[PDB]
């Protein structure tokens, strides 16, 4: 589970992200679309080129949802309640895909926060993203 230390690590690392949250969100998406092509099937109405305003705008949305999760890390189920319904019921996103996005998010942070991405924080972030993923697919199991 998310231990007191994990909670602290996540809050600190995310705190470092600061204003670049939206940018890193767009970057993780772009990394996912390129490394894992299957994920693109979910975004037909999206132009997934490099300067895409659609991907830029969506990254901001993903970032804000994670900020919400960090701010309410002890009641994520409630906080993310609406997003689960969206991804599960409406979008039918394959559970496997949350792991690909999670990995791409970790890769983006590693590329932007050398000092913070220690093995310890890395493990905390992984558990955190794993917890966000569990909630978003909870309308399955």
């Amino acid at each position: 589970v998310l231990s007191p230390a994990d909670k602290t690590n996540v809050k600190a690392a995310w705190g470092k992200v600061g204003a670049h949250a939206g940018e890193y969100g767009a970057e993780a998406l772009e990394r996912m679309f390129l490394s894992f092509p299957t994920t693109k099937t979910y975004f037909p109405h999206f132009d997934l080129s490099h300067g895409s305003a659609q991907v830029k705008g969506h990254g901001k949305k993903v970032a804000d949802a994670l900020t919400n999760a960090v701010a309410h890390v002890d009641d994520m189920p409630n906080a993310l309640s609406a997003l689960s319904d969206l991804h599960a019921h409406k979008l039918r996103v394959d559970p496997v895909n949350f792991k690909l996005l999670s990995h791409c998010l970790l890769v983006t942070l590693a590329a932007h926060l050398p000092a913070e991405f220690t093995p310890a924080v890395h493990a905390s972030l992984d558990k955190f993203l794993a917890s966000v993923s569990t909630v978003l697919t909870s309308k399955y199991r």
Binding site: E27, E30, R31, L34, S35, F36, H103, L106, V107, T108, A110, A111, H112, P114, F117, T118, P119, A120, H122, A123, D126
Partner: protein, 146 residues
């Protein structure tokens, strides 16, 4: 794995700047730290009680160097990874009985380590090419299972 000319260029160019004494130990250590069950395979390595104990473990640093060597080798024989890892596959599969999902996890941790070491240089396209490589290595290592 089939890499485009521009992709092989990206990969190799990056792999050359790689710190062989560092990267390998960092990847294996982070795997043991981030995915604790993997520690059941290296109990003989000593104390893996804490991340600092894991990252400072010389046995971990040393084995890591070996692992990274396997990747370089796979890098040279992308047209024949199956033949290149046949012996390693037999080792991890028939002898150690490591679940194939863990080869995938190590590959991704390796990707994270490269991103951490190269920062901006590790662009999305470059990661895309590396994901293809680690994907190939993981399949090759698992080939003794199918």
């Amino acid at each position: 794995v089939h890499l485009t000319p521009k992709e092989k260029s990206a990969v190799t160019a990056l792999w050359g700047k790689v710190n062989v004494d560092e990267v390998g130990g960092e990847a294996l250590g982070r795997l043991l730290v981030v995915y604790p069950w993997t520690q059941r395979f290296f109990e003989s390595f000593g104390d893996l009680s804490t991340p600092d104990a894991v990252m400072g473990n010389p046995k971990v640093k040393a084995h890591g160097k070996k692992v990274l060597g396997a990747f370089s080798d796979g890098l040279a024989h992308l047209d024949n990874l199956k033949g290149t890892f046949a012996t390693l596959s037999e080792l991890h599969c028939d002898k150690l009985h490591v679940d194939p999902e863990n080869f995938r996890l190590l590959g991704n941790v390796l990707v994270c380590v490269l991103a951490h070491h190269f920062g901006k240089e590790f662009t999305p396209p470059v990661q895309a090419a590396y994901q293809k490589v680690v994907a190939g290595v993981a399949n090759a290592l698992a080939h003794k299972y199918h």
